[PDB]
């Protein structure tokens, strides 16, 4: 084979008897796990044949990468041993490692380096929504009715002080699982609404479902008013 | 199948690795004793449920290997 | 052959395909022993003789300390002429109430105040891109400019495109109502 073969101290100890042709060095070793009792790993440029009793284990947490997100990374890399898959857990952000101590210790350093990359990458994509109101004005109005100075707060002052502070997400108006759960963990205090009179419109901002979601509120809050006449 | 007659468990549990694509790893106390009896390698997972009734060992199959301990 | 070493080295400011074409130009690249990459991971994996193994470990450390001093962001200035409204805040001295009407450049100025965050999608090279779509929304700064009825905005090269999607959908031509 053009790629050299490297064995360990326990792997170069024993002997062998049998017909083992060198026509496919990768397919020969799958039979040599059934004859010699050894394990092997082909990284792409070399073969690492170690002892079967030297198999290690590892429990590594994975912060910013999902379990199915991690599995397609190794397919593109060419380092994935399809003979030795990694053992996943769907609602847990870890994975479990079995194999030769080179391939075991390589993927432990892999998950640590993938998570430190995506800590600098920020996930949130704020978008700006523009709602034209239809049944009321915007901004606070005051009525100088000369017996009492009464104030009437608008839209953008009412739910402004409603969502003040409050590190929390918001729910359901009543009249990729970690990739989603970390954008449905956006703070309700990060909504900021500014009124805008000369188009009678609002300016809102939020993550891409809550700008949908307060517009469910404001659509159910400006009803068309009715006329009452007096005598 | 295969009949074991007073052979050590080091070669016997390696013989499971000679048949199964997933290798078999045993401990120091697990490779110490011996075995005598008919134990066919047609189902390595169903054989070990009988080997908790014959040898007095415990086993765990994670999906890619078998960990047989004392 | 039994002395072959391994190495796991992180790579901060260089991509995996960015690193591979560096060794082709250097002449140090052993085509017999390629480096093992990972497309969504900022590392690489090393196999070979202990001189060539230990050389490329010192290579990735020296390449990353260079590009920390180099800053990636290229702010550009955009100029939008408005068409359907004025600029700047107007006040109406209507002698019953002093009402204020904020312009464009005061409304979305206080909208994006603070907020270390990027901005998304208006509703009415993978690390090289993800670090310029990780620009702060607070770094937008807009100044009104009256005598051409135009705005001055600044941002990284997609968000100056992106707030102009907003302001194009925010100055509609107003309509006339007459009274009797």
Swiss-Prot record, chain B:
Annotated compartments: Cell outer membrane
Disruption phenotype: Insertion mutants are hypoinvasive in the HEp-2 cell assay.
Record note on quaternary structure: The core secretion machinery of the T3SS is composed of approximately 20 different proteins, including cytoplasmic components, a base, an export apparatus and a needle. This subunit is part of the base, which anchors the injectisome in the bacterial cell envelope. Forms a stable homooligomeric complex. The complex is composed of 15 subunits.
Family to which this protein belongs: Belongs to the bacterial secretin family. T3SS SctC subfamily.
Function: Component of the type III secretion system (T3SS), also called injectisome, which is used to inject bacterial effector proteins into eukaryotic host cells. Forms a ring-shaped multimeric structure with an apparent central pore in the outer membrane.
Protein's name in the database: SPI-1 type 3 secretion system secretin
Portion held of the full protein: 34 to 103 of 562
